Amino acid sequence: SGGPVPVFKKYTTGSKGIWEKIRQLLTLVPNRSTGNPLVKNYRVPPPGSQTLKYKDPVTIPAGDIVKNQYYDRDHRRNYPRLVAFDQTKVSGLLTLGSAQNPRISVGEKGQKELAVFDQSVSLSSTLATIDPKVVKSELLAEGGSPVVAPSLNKKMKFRLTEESEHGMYPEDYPIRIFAQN
Amino acid sequence: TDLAKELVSGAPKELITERVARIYQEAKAATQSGQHNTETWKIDWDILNKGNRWENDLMGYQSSSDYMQGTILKFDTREGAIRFAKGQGWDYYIQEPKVRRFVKKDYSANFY
Amino acid sequence: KEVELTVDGVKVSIEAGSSIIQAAEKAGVTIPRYCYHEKLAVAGNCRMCLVEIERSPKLAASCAMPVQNGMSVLTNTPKIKKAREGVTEMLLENHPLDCPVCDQGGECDLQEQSLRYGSDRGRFHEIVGKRAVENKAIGPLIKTSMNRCIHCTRCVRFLNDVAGAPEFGTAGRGNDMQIGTYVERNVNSELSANVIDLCPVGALTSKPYAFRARPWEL
Amino acid sequence: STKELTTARIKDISKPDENNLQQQAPNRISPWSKSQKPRAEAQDNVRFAVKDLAKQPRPYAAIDLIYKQPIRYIEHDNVAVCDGNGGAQGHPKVYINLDQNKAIPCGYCGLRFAQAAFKEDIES
Amino acid sequence: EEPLPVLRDLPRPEYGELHAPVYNPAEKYKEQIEELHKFGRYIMGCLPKFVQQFSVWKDELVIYVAPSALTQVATFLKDHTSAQFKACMDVTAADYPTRTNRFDVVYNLLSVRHNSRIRIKTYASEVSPVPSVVPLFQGANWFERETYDLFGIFFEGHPDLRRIMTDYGFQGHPLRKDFPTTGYTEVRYDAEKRRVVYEPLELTQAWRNFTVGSSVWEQVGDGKDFTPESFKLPTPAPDP
Amino acid sequence: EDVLMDFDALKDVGSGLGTAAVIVLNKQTDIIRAIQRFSAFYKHESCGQCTPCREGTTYLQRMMDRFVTGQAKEKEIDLIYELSKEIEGHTICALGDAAAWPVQGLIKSFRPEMVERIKQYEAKLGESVSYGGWTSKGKVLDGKVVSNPIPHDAHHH
């Protein structure tokens, strides 16, 4: 927890000897820093005089000379395709089912039903004449419950916290602090 | 289609009475075997007979007064390009793209 | 005489004896190529157009393999992707790092097809170095930088068959094979300069146009 | 003579004068490109009427400096390798063929390389 | 009392050859893709009369409606308990001169209730009217003004529609594809008239079109299919 | 020990009965140099029209020259094996296939003997060699690579 820290543990120029004793007596908060960076510590090796020998970092699976076929990591050309669902295809999915739960007849009898949804088929007409259990199981969820808008992050919860934890303003200030929970 | 949409576009009248646009499909470059650029229809404007380019004497810059010199519209179909040009009331002309004649090509023909 | 073949699940129909690379273009499928030109004789010396015939254990060059009825052609399987990267690596093994000083920079087929179909990284770290080839003098029109040639024989095929000038050919064997006229002479043809357009790389370039512009400016 | 000051030449027919402000460069009289505007013509402008020509930027001509560098002669090898003599701070590494009986310059640095067997032929 | 340590001299860890997973970034959206497909289908089922089609890309759902259906769909997406999109974060447009209706009018909604976002797409021409969602979302007042200023789209029902970005008396709509990037006129101070005046555009250096250097080869292929298995038309069983 | 001379029995064990040319190799021989000789043979005998064998054989010859001396790394054993795969099945004629099998045969059954050269070579040079035969001091000066042992094995001449 980011509690108070003594002044000598902060990388700022401070007072010495008698002038340090005087500062502690007169300052309301003696542990605060003056904000002047330490001349002997801050930026003492300048970026142009660093002794570090830099090397380009490379990962093994994607930056090696072996077992590194590019198409195995070519995510840009394996982008998701853009698919739009109109009322004709939704009616087909509702009437014939999906490939996950097929409800379409077999053989030539099944291809007749598929060719129905190759032209305009209104969804309202499909809903008008259809078994209601299909709507309660495919279009709706949990036996007819409405489909709630899906969350962008299911782990976005919060919990109310008190001053002893978050260290912010006490309860008499008109703001509150929510943690991750 | 028949609506004169140029009355509300805000463009100056010189685009109609003084400038000519070309509707064309880009020809395949002779230095490359790719044909991607030839799949779209484009519209550009003919250069001004004077003031299209002149040399600035201070630095040798290419000065110009044609505000349409760098505008090239992109269309997916020829009909869309014609419909847009007609809608804006532009004076245009279409350059029909050249089509390559198909000739059979086989390795056996190198000896027969 | 039409044959109904398949290219990546697309029905195609062309005249009998047509190459697979011709049927692929009619089907809208793009196959990389260096040595194939739709106006020159068929060569198979570049191996960039390799495709996988459905029932065959061998990869066929689409520019030379004739079409058959019922033939199904795959052009984007991982096996072909391996072949394209492998052939690209071989082409760029000895190619000089000349793009900044090479007039084909912005209109190079070797650059674009290596970017599109080759890998993003090279593995040639040899200390012996690349092949070095001296520049041939064939007149004031065609500028030669023969380090950049990929031995595709477009110039040889054009000048012998189309232009009708047989003084240009391939001399040598193996890695020491050099395009040129062997002896010190020029190319005598009113259509010789078309060799500059046909050369996909900067090996043959326009001498009057040298260094003066980049294609994206024009 | 205003003919050496306004025409591109391979060599200057006289010795350049470092104090002459009509030369293309302090170390070169004539321009080194056919499309390079002569300095004398450029300075004959209304904007140089009350301007001191001595303080204008006059960098040395690189064409005269590069040819003061001696030819690098390679022993027991027909291929020369150059990367700018700086490595990561130079130019892309290229390989120069030396089969021909002449010095061949680098495509980037302009340093000329040749075989030692052709040293007598090149120097004469 | 102790001196502060020199952070430069502190020891640092030693790492060998690093490793990293290689996977498609689209794989992490598998739950988002399927949930949005079900929610997008639920909206079409609730509004078959208005919803032309819907699309799902990773974690973004788009609803496509006609101009005459914009008010109803926005009202439904705002007041329905399962879809409480009270905030309209953006209203924008895009120009497609190829199509009969040039402009796609895009509405991005946010639901702080369920931590969800949705998109509404409609279409407009240079003269066709589009209903104003200002009565529904008061925050769309300035966005619709900006859309008109840069495109010219007719927003019917806007309480105060006018320019918001261009100069007073500006002619043309800059974000149209036919509008030149440099405009038609420029300003300068006229000493004779003692004021700033508009004059026809003249450039000391014309804008150089380097876009003509685009690649002559296609760069991205047909892509990979990421449609959920529960949203593919079934293939019938083979012959007996 | 149990090889029968056949187009199939030798096929099963991973070899081929091309022309019955049996070459015997006793333990007192340089196995890597012998295989390196095969790679140099096909580079010189490559007709040079297809891209793979015109470039791959030169690529294999360059890498085999560093293996015979040990101026390489252990990971490059898999690199040269991959390069041989890029030659097979991508050529007009079978010389490209014939130029990859001898290298793969060395890797398949005699890989530890190839690693021994690399380990031994580092002892003489002290510091380990990087990819392609480069050291920590090798750099190019005035037309040549200096401060680095270069494998001068390209037939000199």
Ligand code: SF4
């Ligand atoms: S030919 Fe192409 S790849 Fe080779 S140097 Fe020129 S631009 Fe680069």
Ligand code: SF4
């Ligand atoms: S010089 Fe050019 S056209 Fe001729 S073979 Fe080489 S790459 Fe092909």
Ligand code: SF4
């Ligand atoms: S694989 Fe055969 S035909 Fe092709 S270049 Fe090599 S030797 Fe010649």
Ligand code: FES
């Ligand atoms: S394009 Fe077919 S091998 Fe060259």
Ligand SMILES: [K+]
């Ligand atoms: K060329």
Ligand SMILES: [Zn+2]
């Ligand atoms: Zn150099």
